[PDB]
């Protein structure tokens, strides 16, 4: 299973994470001691949800459950036990795909990588001086212990504040002079004991309080130090903090997990002194053995911990004011601070991200992202060069290729294919045991938790092995202590289980990965997660074979579980019968809206009367073919330059891709309107709207709302809504115009929902959610109407297409089939790609892919080639050229392979009919269609809305915004002679309530006027500087007159 | 990010450098030679004049 960091994490929270939080919260007491409240956390209910999975997405709700615990309220003096179940909070459940539904939108919880708790030592040179060793005891939650060591044998303890001597903390926790020196070399400790005095057990708590809290008190020094490291519910090492203390310092005690042991502070000082004696290891901060990951089971444990602490303040403020008895325990627990704590984590936190649902490849990748940012991780400004590079401990755990380019280059990683996280939070990799030069591929792997660095010798999965005898190679390259070396095959210990263990699940879909560059393989893995689901997908011919596993783990593929006989198959359900209440129904969704405006259509695959197996595809998804995944189409390609139509990364396609419904996707948009409550009068949805005739009232059913199946275009009316007005401030021009022809204006105003510019399609869902029907509504709303419009988009000029090797491009021309070049059998060419971008970017694998897919086209065999071989030069060139020779041995196909030029044939011109001078490489390429279509990039504005303060035009496609003329754009016009264009762009086009009126009136009348006025943004800055206490004004230097000018008035 | 902040600092230090007059009447000069980086030359004398 590829999703185990989400399913096993939420399963741990429902049985171990929720029980541990309620056991530490209980019991609580009052100020006097009259009654006590303790919970029973291990007997909670977790009742049934309210709505369905598909119903919660359209009703704008969350798939959540109610949490109830039994609560026993006892009293100290009077014997009474009050058992009652009290509501705790709303907990959203994880769906079957591993996601959550928050406010009708599907969301994921990205796993965040942080540092592991423990002690870490570091050699630091602050200046050109001696060698200083530092320390840092990091807990899971609480204060930090930073031990430093200066020159001349002075070890200090810093607990944010100023540093202090090591004897001050070591004596205040409770110790003797003989219990320190017996377990310490004590000759180095005499230099820090001379210039520190010699305090007793009570002569150190007073001096500790004088420097931390600057009167000292004998009772104040004990309450300050115990609350930092020794008090419960304020300092936590964690289950993994106790494990890292017993490994580094080699401690004998274990299973403490709550209180910091004072013997552990003595062991951290002893390891720091011995670092000057050239013994001990300096820890690394970028090592994956020191870096942990956490998931939904751990991140939810911190939100209930800060949510129950707010509940502890109200539970102690209600058992003291009410001095009377006979009170119910259900009124002591207020669920309001804990409901708002869970709702803030799932909807308002940064780590809960919007789920990418373009294709099943992006859904599987987004659940396995390893990001180093979040509330407790790193910062965008605090990220440096060392944290973004690849550590040598990332071999097989984190993918070195798949990472987003730009700002987050290296901070957001991806988990590898065979990687696995244990219960402690460390990434593990499987390895096969090698015994005396023989790979023992018979038993289960070892799953080493990054402990193979300083102990084991690990070989990758690329060495030639024999059939159970020995290893063929005499020099095996291995890795030992983060360095590569070639040793004997009898000296190795472990070997990798797969050659795709290093790369992730999205990089493994690229065939011939070893022939492509690592920079273009980064782009090829990112463009595969943006491919739209087509209308009829097609499986690739040069697939790697891992597409079948990624389709079943995405959750959008109906699988069988019963091993039965299929009875009834239609377009909505599949009914089988289980055998060794026997009729289950598998529902099939038809054209459901996704998050990225794509389709989630499922098609039936099986027929009636067929034996099935557990793990068989019953119904494939939208971007999924039969069994395996399918994100694009296999069509003909040719690497030849046309007449400037493929000049700089441009694509020339044919007309055959248009009328054959190739690269044709279905996009479903969703519109929203609401009949709110205006204080002047309630708004309602009517059909008789003013100033709109029969040109737009054709699809309404006398209710103001459109019908199902009506073709809407740009500028129509979906929901006709009116709004009452109470202005009554008519100008004298409109009063004279209305008095002539009559037709007195009504009190309503047309606020109908309309279709935006460049939008069309067919309406498929006109679901209306009103009150008194069984659904909750937001306050200040009478009727909520939701309109879903689906449209069928073909492939056009301006769309961005790409392949699996980073050869992205934008189509500039769609030629007919008689103008495209044609093969010597008469078959035309679909895509005419440019061969100039190939040798400059090292995209060699895309030439191996098309030449192998052309061999699979004439044979019809659908090759499955795994990456990272076999014999050198005999597995990539002679595989392609050897299989192209077999396709040429057919009696009908003799023109496929040539002896002089192997990977080339003769191509004829379509316009003139003459052959070209040189042979051209042809093949069957697998191209994808990305989400960056030409329809979403069109924006234009003449005059629209304006800003609130600066009175400048707004910015945005969805709100009719204007393009920003920034500071780099002024410097280009200032370097030109364009002074009148610069004054026009800053005055009459932005921030002038007077200059915009006269400039617009000049074009309609036909006589332009010069000299625009003062812009509004300068007068805002003039009033802001006067409010800062600065007498700033503008004057005139005219003859015998120095007067201030009034820019505002 | 380093070249963007460097370009902004070069603009504000030389934003008021406009050619206003035709001649000033100075007598100083700048001696220019062939830019030789040790053994081989990079910019010839014909490219600097």
């Amino acid at each position: 299973d590829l999703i185990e960091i989400q399913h096993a994490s939420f399963h741990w929270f429902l049985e171990e994470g929720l029980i541990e939080e309620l056991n530490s919260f209980s019991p609580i007491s009052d100020y006097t001691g009259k009654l006590e409240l303790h919970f029973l956390g291990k007997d909670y209910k977790l009742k049934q949800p309210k709505y369905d999975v598909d119903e919660s997405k359209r009703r704008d709700a969350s798939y959540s459950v109610q949490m109830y615990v039994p609560t026993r309220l006892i009293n100290k003096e009077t014997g009474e036990i009050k058992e009652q179940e009290v509501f705790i909070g709303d907990l959203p459940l994880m769906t079957e795909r591993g996601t959550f539904i928050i406010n009708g939108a599907e969301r994921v919880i990205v796993n965040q990588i942080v540092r592991s708790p423990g002690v870490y030592y570091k050699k630091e040179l602050d200046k050109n001086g001696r060698r200083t060793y530092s320390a840092s005891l990091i807990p899971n939650r609480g204060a930090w212990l930073k031990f430093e060591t200066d020159k001349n044998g002075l070890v200090y303890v810093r607990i944010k504040t100023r540093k202090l001597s090591a004897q001050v903390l070591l004596k205040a926790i409770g110790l003797s002079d003989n219990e320190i020196l017996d377990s310490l070399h004590p000759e180095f400790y005499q230099k820090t004991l001379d210039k520190e005095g010699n305090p007793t057990e009570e002569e150190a708590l007073v001096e500790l309080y004088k420097k931390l809290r600057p009167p000292p008190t004998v009772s104040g020094g004990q309450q300050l130090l115990e609350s930092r490291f020794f008090d419960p519910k304020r300092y936590d090492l964690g289950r993994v903090g106790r494990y890292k203390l017993n490994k580094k310092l080699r401690l004998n005690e274990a299973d403490t997990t709550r209180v910091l042991t004072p013997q552990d502070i003595l062991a951290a000082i002893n390891y720091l002194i011995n670092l000057e004696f050239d013994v001990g290891t300096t820890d690394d901060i970028d090592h994956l053995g020191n870096r942990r990951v956490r998931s939904v089971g751990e991140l939810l444990q911190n939100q209930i911990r800060v949510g129950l602490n707010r509940l502890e303040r109200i539970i102690r403020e209600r058992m003291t004011v009410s001095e009377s008895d006979a009170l119910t325990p259900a009124s002591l627990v207020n669920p309001k601070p804990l409901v708002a704590a869970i709702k803030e984590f799932f909807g308002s936190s940064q780590l809960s991200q919007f789920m990418d649902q373009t294709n099943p490849l992006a859904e599987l990748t987004h659940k396995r992202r390893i990001s180093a940012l979040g509330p407790g991780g790193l910062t965008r400004e605090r990220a440096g060069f060392a944290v973004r590079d690849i550590h040598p401990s990332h071999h097989g755990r984190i993918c070195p290729v798949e990472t987003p380019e730009g700002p987050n280059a290296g901070l957001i990683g991806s988990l590898a294919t065979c990687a696995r996280v244990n219960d402690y939070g460390f990434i593990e990799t499987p390895y096969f045991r090698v015994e005396s030069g023989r790979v023992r591929k018979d038993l289960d792997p070892v799953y080493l938790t990054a402990d193979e660095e300083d102990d084991m010798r690990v070989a990758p999965g690329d060495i030639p092995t024999d059939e159970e005898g020995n290893i063929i190679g005499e020099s095996v390259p291995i890795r030992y202590r983060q360095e590569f070396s070639t040793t004997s095959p009898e000296q190795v210990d472990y070997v990798a289980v797969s050659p795709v263990q290093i790369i992730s699940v999205a990089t493994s879909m690229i065939p011939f990965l070893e022939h492509d560059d690592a920079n273009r393989a980064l782009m090829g893995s990112n463009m595969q997660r943006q491919a739209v689901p087509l209308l009829r997908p097609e499986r690739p011919l040069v697939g790697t074979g891992l597409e079948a596993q990624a389709a079943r783990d995405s959750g959008m593929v109906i699988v069988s579980r019963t091993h039965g006989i299929v009875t009834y198959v239609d377009a909505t359900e599949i009914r089988v019968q289980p055998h060794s209440g026997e009729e289950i129904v598998y529902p099939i969704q038809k054209y459901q809206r996704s998050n990225q405006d794509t389709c989630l259509n499922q098609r039936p695959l099986v027929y009636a009367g067929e034996d099935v197996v557990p793990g068989q595809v019953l119904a494939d998804g939208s971007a999924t073919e039969g069994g395996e995944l399918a994100l694009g189409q296999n069509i003909l390609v040719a690497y030849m330059p046309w007449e400037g139509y493929n000049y700089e990364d441009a694509i020339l396609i044919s007309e055959r891709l248009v009328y054959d419904d190739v690269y044709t996707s279905i996009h479903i948009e969703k519109f929203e309107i609401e009949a709110r409550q205006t204080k002047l009068g309630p708004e309602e949805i009517t059909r008789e709207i003013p100033n709109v005739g029969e040109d737009a009232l054709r699809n309404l059913d006398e209710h103001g709302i459109i019908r199902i199946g009506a073709w809407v275009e740009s500028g129509d009316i979906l929901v006709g809504k009116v709004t009452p007005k109470g202005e009554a401030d008519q100008p004298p021009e409109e009063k004279l115009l209305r008095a002539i022809f009559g037709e007195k204006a009504r009190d309503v105003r047309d606020n109908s929902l309309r279709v935006p510019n460049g939008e069309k399609g067919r309406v498929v869902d006109v679901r209306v959610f009103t009150r008194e029907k069984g659904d909750e509504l937001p306050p200040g709303a009478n009727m909520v109407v939701r309109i879903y419009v689906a449209q069928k988009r073909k492939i056009q000029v301006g769309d961005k297409m790409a392949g699996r090797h980073g050869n992205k491009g934008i189509i500039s021309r769609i030629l007919p089939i008689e103008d495209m070049p044609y093969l010597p059998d008469g078959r035309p060419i679909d895509i005419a790609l440019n061969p100039l971008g190939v040798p400059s970017r090292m995209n060699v694998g895309q030439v191996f892919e098309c030449l192998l897919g052309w061999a699979g086209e004439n044979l019809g065999v659908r090759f499955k080639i795994t990456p990272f071989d076999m014999y050198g030069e005999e597995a990539s060139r002679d595989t392609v050229h050897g299989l192209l020779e077999e396709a040429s041995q057919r009696p009908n196909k003799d023109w496929v392979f040539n002896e002089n030029h192997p990977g080339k044939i003769q191509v004829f011109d379509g316009r003139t009919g003459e052959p070209f001078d040189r042979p051209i490489t042809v093949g069957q390429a697998y191209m994808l269609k990305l989400v960056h279509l030409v329809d979403d990039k069109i924006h234009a504005r003449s005059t629209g809305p304006y800003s609130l303060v600066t009175q400048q035009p707004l910015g945005g496609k969805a709100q009719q915004g204007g393009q920003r003329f920034g500071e780099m754009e002024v410097w280009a016009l200032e370097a030109y002679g364009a002074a009148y264009i610069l004054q026009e762009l800053l005055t009459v086009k932005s921030d002038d309530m007077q200059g915009r009126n006269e400039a617009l009136n000049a074009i309609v009348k036909g006589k332009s006027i010069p000299r625009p006025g003062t812009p509004e943004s300068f007068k805002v800055l003039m009033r802001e500087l006067q409010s800062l206490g600065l007498d700033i004004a503008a004057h005139k230097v005219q003859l015998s007159e120095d007067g201030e000018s009034a820019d505002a008035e | 990010a380093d070249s963007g902040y460097l370009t902004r600092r070069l603009v504000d230090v030389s934003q008021d450098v406009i050619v206003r007059e035709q001649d000033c009447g100075t007598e100083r000069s700048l001696r220019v030679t062939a830019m030789t980086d040790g053994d081989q030359v990079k910019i010839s004398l014909a490219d600097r004049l």
Binding site: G977, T987, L1028 | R9, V13, D16
Partner: protein, 97 residues
């Protein structure tokens, strides 16, 4: 282009300020007909230091350290005559280039 003048007792020029080298020779030659004093040491300024020591406070506050330029301009009583670029863009007039 700037210089750090010293020994000022006749003209209101405290030792430690940065003025242009052409402006020092314009006032020294104009004071030679009367007879007075004195010395100045040349300094090399960076691209962010010479941008803040200009005659315009609007061009220096929009670049960097807005709270430091406007504090110095209010106490000294500086005046901007809108000479050069990057002021008429903020004002709303034609650039002098």
């Amino acid at each position: 282009a700037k210089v750090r003048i010293d020994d000022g007792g006749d003209t209101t020029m405290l030792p430690g300020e940065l003025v242009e080298l052409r402006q020092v020779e314009q006032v020294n030659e104009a004071m030679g007909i009367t007879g007075s004093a004195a010395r100045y040491t040349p300094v090399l300024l960076g691209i962010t230091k010479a941008s803040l020591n200009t005659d315009s406070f609007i061009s220096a506050a929009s670049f960097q350290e807005t709270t430091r330029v406007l504090t110095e301009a209010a106490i000294e009583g500086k005046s901007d005559w809108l000479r050069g670029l990057k002021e008429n863009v903020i004002i709303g007039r034609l650039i002098p280039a």
